[model samples]
Target: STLSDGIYTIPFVAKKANDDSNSSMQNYFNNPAWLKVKNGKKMVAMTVNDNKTVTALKTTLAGTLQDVKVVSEDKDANTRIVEFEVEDLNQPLAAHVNYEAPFNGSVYKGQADFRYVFDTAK
Candidate 1:
Protein backbone atom coordinates (compact mmCIF):
# COMPACT_ATOMS: atom_id res chain seq x y z
CA SER A 1 0.00 0.00 0.00
CA THR A 2 2.91 2.37 -0.61
CA LEU A 3 1.09 5.17 -2.34
CA SER A 4 2.55 8.61 -2.87
CA ASP A 5 0.34 11.40 -1.58
CA GLY A 6 0.87 13.35 -4.76
CA ILE A 7 -2.75 14.26 -5.56
CA TYR A 8 -5.71 14.61 -3.17
CA THR A 9 -9.35 15.62 -2.78
CA ILE A 10 -10.56 19.07 -3.90
CA PRO A 11 -13.78 19.27 -1.82
CA PHE A 12 -17.21 19.82 -3.41
CA VAL A 13 -20.92 18.94 -3.21
CA ALA A 14 -23.62 18.04 -5.76
CA LYS A 15 -27.37 18.67 -5.63
CA LYS A 16 -30.17 18.10 -8.14
CA ALA A 17 -33.91 18.34 -7.89
CA ASN A 18 -36.40 15.42 -8.01
CA ASP A 19 -34.59 13.29 -10.58
CA ASP A 20 -33.68 10.48 -8.22
CA SER A 21 -32.26 7.09 -9.24
CA ASN A 22 -30.11 8.68 -11.93
CA SER A 23 -26.70 7.00 -12.36
CA SER A 24 -25.07 10.11 -10.97
CA MET A 25 -27.62 10.55 -8.22
CA GLN A 26 -27.38 7.05 -6.75
CA ASN A 27 -23.61 7.42 -6.51
CA TYR A 28 -24.34 10.12 -3.99
CA PHE A 29 -27.54 9.07 -2.22
CA ASN A 30 -26.69 5.36 -2.22
CA ASN A 31 -22.93 5.08 -2.72
CA PRO A 32 -20.46 7.24 -0.74
CA ALA A 33 -20.42 10.23 -3.11
CA TRP A 34 -19.56 13.01 -0.70
CA LEU A 35 -17.72 16.27 -1.37
CA LYS A 36 -15.87 17.23 1.82
CA VAL A 37 -16.50 18.20 5.41
CA LYS A 38 -17.90 21.66 4.98
CA ASN A 39 -17.70 24.51 7.55
CA GLY A 40 -19.95 22.25 9.64
CA LYS A 41 -18.04 19.04 8.82
CA LYS A 42 -19.52 16.61 6.20
CA MET A 43 -18.34 14.20 3.50
CA VAL A 44 -15.59 11.74 2.31
CA ALA A 45 -14.47 8.39 0.64
CA MET A 46 -12.32 6.30 -1.90
CA THR A 47 -8.74 6.33 -3.28
CA VAL A 48 -7.41 7.39 -6.72
CA ASN A 49 -4.83 5.88 -9.02
CA ASP A 50 -4.97 4.68 -12.63
CA ASN A 51 -8.74 5.07 -12.77
CA LYS A 52 -9.27 4.41 -9.07
CA THR A 53 -12.35 6.59 -9.05
CA VAL A 54 -13.63 4.75 -12.09
CA THR A 55 -13.11 1.36 -10.43
CA ALA A 56 -14.41 2.70 -7.15
CA LEU A 57 -17.59 3.76 -8.90
CA LYS A 58 -17.70 0.77 -11.18
CA THR A 59 -17.23 -1.65 -8.32
CA THR A 60 -19.61 0.25 -6.12
CA LEU A 61 -22.49 1.99 -7.87
CA ALA A 62 -21.47 0.15 -11.09
CA GLY A 63 -22.77 3.26 -12.84
CA THR A 64 -22.91 6.80 -11.40
CA LEU A 65 -19.42 6.93 -9.96
CA GLN A 66 -18.25 6.16 -13.46
CA ASP A 67 -16.50 8.72 -15.73
CA VAL A 68 -15.24 10.72 -12.76
CA LYS A 69 -11.63 11.47 -13.71
CA VAL A 70 -8.83 13.21 -11.84
CA VAL A 71 -8.64 16.68 -13.29
CA SER A 72 -5.94 18.36 -11.21
CA GLU A 73 -4.19 18.60 -7.84
CA ASP A 74 -3.96 21.46 -5.40
CA LYS A 75 -0.64 23.30 -5.55
CA ASP A 76 -1.44 25.85 -2.85
CA ALA A 77 -1.88 23.63 0.22
CA ASN A 78 -0.09 20.88 2.10
CA THR A 79 -3.11 18.62 1.96
CA ARG A 80 -3.15 16.59 -1.22
CA ILE A 81 -6.87 17.43 -1.82
CA VAL A 82 -7.14 16.49 -5.51
CA GLU A 83 -9.87 17.62 -7.92
CA PHE A 84 -12.28 15.46 -9.89
CA GLU A 85 -14.58 16.13 -12.86
CA VAL A 86 -17.84 14.86 -14.30
CA GLU A 87 -18.25 12.34 -11.49
CA ASP A 88 -21.94 12.35 -12.31
CA LEU A 89 -21.81 13.58 -15.88
CA ASN A 90 -25.58 13.78 -16.40
CA GLN A 91 -25.45 15.69 -13.16
CA PRO A 92 -22.33 17.28 -14.76
CA LEU A 93 -20.89 17.39 -11.27
CA ALA A 94 -17.50 17.92 -9.58
CA ALA A 95 -16.02 16.27 -6.43
CA HIS A 96 -12.99 15.22 -4.39
CA VAL A 97 -11.36 12.01 -3.01
CA ASN A 98 -9.62 12.26 0.32
CA TYR A 99 -10.12 11.71 4.08
CA GLU A 100 -13.43 12.38 5.76
CA ALA A 101 -13.76 13.06 9.49
CA PRO A 102 -15.21 10.63 12.00
CA PHE A 103 -18.74 11.95 11.77
CA ASN A 104 -20.55 11.06 15.02
CA GLY A 105 -17.84 8.48 15.60
CA SER A 106 -19.09 6.80 12.45
CA VAL A 107 -17.07 5.68 9.45
CA TYR A 108 -18.66 4.17 6.35
CA LYS A 109 -18.29 0.45 5.62
CA GLY A 110 -16.50 0.84 2.31
CA GLN A 111 -13.80 -1.19 0.55
CA ALA A 112 -11.80 -1.29 -2.74
CA ASP A 113 -9.50 -4.08 -3.95
CA PHE A 114 -6.90 -2.72 -6.39
CA ARG A 115 -4.20 -5.18 -5.36
CA TYR A 116 -3.63 -6.33 -8.89
CA VAL A 117 -2.87 -2.87 -10.32
CA PHE A 118 0.26 -2.26 -8.32
CA ASP A 119 3.88 -2.76 -9.39
CA THR A 120 4.30 -5.64 -11.76
CA ALA A 121 7.10 -6.66 -14.13
CA LYS A 122 6.73 -4.50 -17.17
Candidate 2:
Protein backbone atom coordinates (compact mmCIF):
# COMPACT_ATOMS: atom_id res chain seq x y z
CA SER A 1 0.00 0.00 0.00
CA THR A 2 1.18 3.55 -0.65
CA LEU A 3 1.69 5.60 2.53
CA SER A 4 0.64 9.20 2.20
CA ASP A 5 2.87 12.06 3.29
CA GLY A 6 2.36 13.85 6.68
CA ILE A 7 2.07 10.44 8.26
CA TYR A 8 4.04 10.17 11.47
CA THR A 9 5.55 6.93 12.78
CA ILE A 10 6.53 6.67 16.44
CA PRO A 11 8.57 3.77 17.81
CA PHE A 12 8.86 2.66 21.42
CA VAL A 13 10.16 -0.09 23.74
CA ALA A 14 8.20 -1.55 26.66
CA LYS A 15 9.38 -3.25 29.84
CA LYS A 16 7.22 -5.09 32.30
CA ALA A 17 7.26 -3.33 35.66
CA ASN A 18 7.16 -6.61 37.56
CA ASP A 19 9.23 -8.75 35.22
CA ASP A 20 12.05 -7.82 32.94
CA SER A 21 11.36 -10.86 30.82
CA ASN A 22 8.14 -9.20 29.74
CA SER A 23 9.65 -6.45 27.67
CA SER A 24 8.80 -5.53 24.10
CA MET A 25 8.71 -2.86 21.44
CA GLN A 26 5.71 -1.21 19.84
CA ASN A 27 4.89 1.36 17.18
CA TYR A 28 1.95 3.76 17.40
CA PHE A 29 1.19 5.69 14.26
CA ASN A 30 -1.13 8.65 14.53
CA ASN A 31 -2.82 10.76 11.90
CA PRO A 32 -5.84 12.95 11.38
CA ALA A 33 -8.54 10.68 12.69
CA TRP A 34 -11.04 12.77 10.77
CA LEU A 35 -9.41 13.32 7.43
CA LYS A 36 -9.26 11.86 3.92
CA VAL A 37 -6.77 12.24 1.08
CA LYS A 38 -8.12 12.81 -2.39
CA ASN A 39 -4.60 13.25 -3.76
CA GLY A 40 -1.45 11.73 -2.28
CA LYS A 41 1.03 14.57 -2.92
CA LYS A 42 -1.22 17.55 -2.31
CA MET A 43 -1.52 16.89 1.44
CA VAL A 44 -4.95 18.41 1.55
CA ALA A 45 -6.11 18.15 5.14
CA MET A 46 -9.57 16.94 6.03
CA THR A 47 -11.30 15.80 9.19
CA VAL A 48 -12.85 12.37 9.45
CA ASN A 49 -15.99 11.81 11.47
CA ASP A 50 -15.46 9.08 14.02
CA ASN A 51 -16.34 5.75 12.54
CA LYS A 52 -18.21 3.27 14.71
CA THR A 53 -15.52 0.65 14.30
CA VAL A 54 -12.78 3.12 15.14
CA THR A 55 -14.60 4.33 18.23
CA ALA A 56 -15.27 0.77 19.36
CA LEU A 57 -11.65 -0.23 18.96
CA LYS A 58 -10.40 2.82 20.81
CA THR A 59 -12.80 2.26 23.68
CA THR A 60 -11.90 -1.43 23.93
CA LEU A 61 -8.18 -0.72 24.02
CA ALA A 62 -8.45 2.18 26.41
CA GLY A 63 -10.57 0.11 28.76
CA THR A 64 -7.74 -2.39 29.12
CA LEU A 65 -5.02 0.15 29.77
CA GLN A 66 -4.29 1.84 33.09
CA ASP A 67 -2.62 4.96 31.76
CA VAL A 68 -1.64 6.41 28.39
CA LYS A 69 0.40 9.53 27.87
CA VAL A 70 2.00 11.37 24.97
CA VAL A 71 5.66 11.53 25.98
CA SER A 72 7.19 13.43 23.10
CA GLU A 73 6.66 14.64 19.56
CA ASP A 74 8.94 15.28 16.60
CA LYS A 75 12.12 14.85 18.66
CA ASP A 76 14.32 15.42 15.63
CA ALA A 77 13.53 18.14 13.14
CA ASN A 78 15.00 15.97 10.42
CA THR A 79 12.34 13.36 11.10
CA ARG A 80 8.75 13.80 12.20
CA ILE A 81 7.97 11.50 15.13
CA VAL A 82 6.05 11.12 18.40
CA GLU A 83 6.43 9.05 21.56
CA PHE A 84 3.84 7.75 24.00
CA GLU A 85 3.93 6.15 27.43
CA VAL A 86 1.66 3.14 27.86
CA GLU A 87 1.59 1.84 31.41
CA ASP A 88 -0.47 -1.18 32.29
CA LEU A 89 -0.57 -1.26 36.09
CA ASN A 90 -2.07 -4.70 36.32
CA GLN A 91 0.53 -5.71 33.75
CA PRO A 92 3.02 -3.16 35.15
CA LEU A 93 5.07 -2.52 32.02
CA ALA A 94 6.60 0.38 30.13
CA ALA A 95 6.46 -0.13 26.41
CA HIS A 96 8.27 1.76 23.70
CA VAL A 97 5.95 4.01 21.70
CA ASN A 98 6.03 4.13 17.92
CA TYR A 99 3.99 6.40 15.71
CA GLU A 100 2.94 6.64 12.04
CA ALA A 101 0.35 8.35 9.87
CA PRO A 102 -2.61 6.57 8.34
CA PHE A 103 -3.10 6.15 4.61
CA ASN A 104 -6.00 6.56 2.23
CA GLY A 105 -8.53 3.95 1.04
CA SER A 106 -7.44 0.34 1.56
CA VAL A 107 -8.46 -2.57 3.78
CA TYR A 108 -5.70 -1.94 6.32
CA LYS A 109 -4.69 1.51 5.14
CA GLY A 110 -6.55 3.60 7.69
CA GLN A 111 -5.60 1.50 10.69
CA ALA A 112 -2.56 2.76 12.57
CA ASP A 113 0.59 0.60 12.61
CA PHE A 114 0.95 -1.07 16.00
CA ARG A 115 3.70 -3.68 15.93
CA TYR A 116 4.60 -5.53 19.11
CA VAL A 117 8.29 -6.34 19.40
CA PHE A 118 7.71 -9.60 21.27
CA ASP A 119 4.75 -11.44 22.74
CA THR A 120 6.00 -11.22 26.30
CA ALA A 121 2.70 -10.20 27.80
CA LYS A 122 1.01 -12.97 25.95
Candidate 3:
Protein backbone atom coordinates (compact mmCIF):
# COMPACT_ATOMS: atom_id res chain seq x y z
CA SER A 1 0.00 0.00 0.00
CA THR A 2 2.88 2.32 0.66
CA LEU A 3 4.86 1.46 -2.42
CA SER A 4 6.78 4.46 -3.65
CA ASP A 5 10.34 3.79 -4.53
CA GLY A 6 10.91 3.05 -8.24
CA ILE A 7 11.78 0.41 -10.77
CA TYR A 8 10.14 -2.88 -9.80
CA THR A 9 10.37 -5.65 -12.35
CA ILE A 10 9.76 -9.07 -10.84
CA PRO A 11 10.15 -11.63 -13.60
CA PHE A 12 9.81 -14.80 -11.61
CA VAL A 13 10.25 -18.42 -12.85
CA ALA A 14 10.98 -21.26 -10.55
CA LYS A 15 9.13 -23.93 -8.68
CA LYS A 16 12.14 -26.15 -8.27
CA ALA A 17 15.43 -26.78 -10.05
CA ASN A 18 17.99 -25.33 -7.64
CA ASP A 19 19.96 -27.60 -5.49
CA ASP A 20 23.49 -27.00 -6.62
CA SER A 21 24.82 -28.73 -3.55
CA ASN A 22 22.20 -26.99 -1.44
CA SER A 23 20.83 -24.21 -3.58
CA SER A 24 22.49 -20.94 -4.59
CA MET A 25 21.59 -18.62 -7.43
CA GLN A 26 20.73 -16.42 -4.51
CA ASN A 27 18.24 -19.17 -3.73
CA TYR A 28 16.00 -17.59 -6.33
CA PHE A 29 15.97 -14.42 -4.29
CA ASN A 30 15.27 -16.59 -1.28
CA ASN A 31 12.54 -18.87 -2.56
CA PRO A 32 9.49 -17.09 -3.93
CA ALA A 33 6.72 -18.07 -6.34
CA TRP A 34 3.62 -16.94 -4.46
CA LEU A 35 0.67 -14.79 -5.44
CA LYS A 36 -2.88 -13.70 -4.51
CA VAL A 37 -3.88 -10.24 -3.46
CA LYS A 38 -6.75 -7.73 -3.43
CA ASN A 39 -9.07 -10.52 -4.58
CA GLY A 40 -8.11 -13.09 -2.02
CA LYS A 41 -8.05 -10.25 0.43
CA LYS A 42 -4.25 -10.00 0.68
CA MET A 43 -1.21 -12.20 0.16
CA VAL A 44 1.81 -11.16 -1.87
CA ALA A 45 5.18 -12.79 -2.24
CA MET A 46 7.57 -12.92 -5.14
CA THR A 47 11.32 -13.36 -5.44
CA VAL A 48 14.01 -13.70 -8.04
CA ASN A 49 17.77 -13.17 -8.29
CA ASP A 50 19.28 -15.41 -10.92
CA ASN A 51 22.57 -14.15 -9.60
CA LYS A 52 24.42 -14.47 -12.90
CA THR A 53 21.54 -12.50 -14.39
CA VAL A 54 17.92 -12.35 -13.21
CA THR A 55 16.83 -10.09 -10.33
CA ALA A 56 13.37 -9.34 -8.95
CA LEU A 57 11.28 -8.72 -5.80
CA LYS A 58 7.66 -8.20 -4.79
CA THR A 59 5.73 -8.10 -1.51
CA THR A 60 3.96 -5.31 0.31
CA LEU A 61 1.14 -5.77 2.71
CA ALA A 62 2.40 -3.48 5.47
CA GLY A 63 2.50 -5.35 9.30
CA THR A 64 0.72 -8.50 10.24
CA LEU A 65 0.98 -11.62 8.06
CA GLN A 66 3.79 -12.31 10.47
CA ASP A 67 5.34 -8.98 9.64
CA VAL A 68 6.06 -9.73 6.04
CA LYS A 69 9.62 -8.73 5.20
CA VAL A 70 11.66 -9.68 2.16
CA VAL A 71 14.85 -7.65 2.15
CA SER A 72 17.62 -8.69 -0.23
CA GLU A 73 21.37 -8.07 -0.14
CA ASP A 74 24.39 -6.98 -2.23
CA LYS A 75 23.31 -3.39 -2.16
CA ASP A 76 26.72 -2.12 -3.35
CA ALA A 77 29.15 -4.99 -3.46
CA ASN A 78 28.01 -5.18 -7.08
CA THR A 79 24.38 -4.11 -7.10
CA ARG A 80 21.44 -6.03 -5.61
CA ILE A 81 18.38 -4.58 -3.96
CA VAL A 82 15.20 -6.53 -3.31
CA GLU A 83 13.07 -5.09 -0.56
CA PHE A 84 9.39 -5.85 0.02
CA GLU A 85 7.85 -5.00 3.35
CA VAL A 86 4.23 -5.41 4.31
CA GLU A 87 1.90 -4.51 7.16
CA ASP A 88 -1.01 -3.01 5.29
CA LEU A 89 0.06 0.14 3.58
CA ASN A 90 -2.75 -0.45 1.09
CA GLN A 91 -2.02 -3.84 -0.35
CA PRO A 92 -1.44 -4.40 -4.07
CA LEU A 93 1.60 -6.40 -5.04
CA ALA A 94 1.76 -10.15 -5.39
CA ALA A 95 4.09 -12.10 -7.64
CA HIS A 96 5.33 -15.58 -8.61
CA VAL A 97 4.77 -15.88 -12.35
CA ASN A 98 7.03 -18.76 -13.28
CA TYR A 99 10.32 -20.56 -12.64
CA GLU A 100 12.21 -23.84 -13.16
CA ALA A 101 15.69 -24.22 -14.53
CA PRO A 102 17.67 -26.91 -12.77
CA PHE A 103 18.04 -30.64 -13.08
CA ASN A 104 20.22 -33.26 -11.44
CA GLY A 105 21.26 -31.15 -8.52
CA SER A 106 17.60 -30.34 -7.83
CA VAL A 107 15.34 -27.30 -7.89
CA TYR A 108 13.08 -27.76 -10.88
CA LYS A 109 9.46 -27.69 -10.03
CA GLY A 110 7.72 -25.47 -12.60
CA GLN A 111 4.76 -23.11 -12.92
CA ALA A 112 5.59 -19.40 -13.02
CA ASP A 113 5.40 -18.51 -16.69
CA PHE A 114 6.33 -14.79 -16.52
CA ARG A 115 5.11 -11.30 -15.75
CA TYR A 116 6.61 -8.91 -13.25
CA VAL A 117 7.03 -5.18 -13.76
CA PHE A 118 6.67 -2.43 -11.19
CA ASP A 119 7.87 1.19 -11.08
CA THR A 120 6.32 3.40 -8.48
CA ALA A 121 8.84 5.99 -7.39
CA LYS A 122 8.11 9.10 -9.38
Top TM-score model = 3
C-alpha TM-score for every candidate: 0.21, 0.21, 0.24
In candidate 1, where is summed lDDT lowest over 10 consecutive residues? Answer: 113-122
Q: How displaced is residue 97 in candidate 3, in Å?
A: 5.6
lDDT of 1: 0.29
Q: Tens-digit lDDT track for model 1 on 4-118?
A: 3233333322333233222232232222233443343322333332232222332213234432333343334321222332222223332222233334666643432211011
Q: Candidate 3 lDDT, tens digit per residue, 1-122?
A: 44333333333322223221322233455333333334323233444344324433333244222222444545344334344433442323334423445566556555332222332222
Where does candidate 2 have its weakest 10-residue lDDT segment? 42-51
Global lDDT of each candidate: 0.29, 0.27, 0.36
- Candidate 3 Cα lDDT to native: 0.36
Task: Name the best candidate (by lDDT).
Answer: 3
lDDT of 2 at 78: 23
TM-score for candidate 2, please give it. Answer: 0.21
Output the better candidate (1/2) by lDDT. 1
TM-score-better candidate, 1 vs 3 = 3
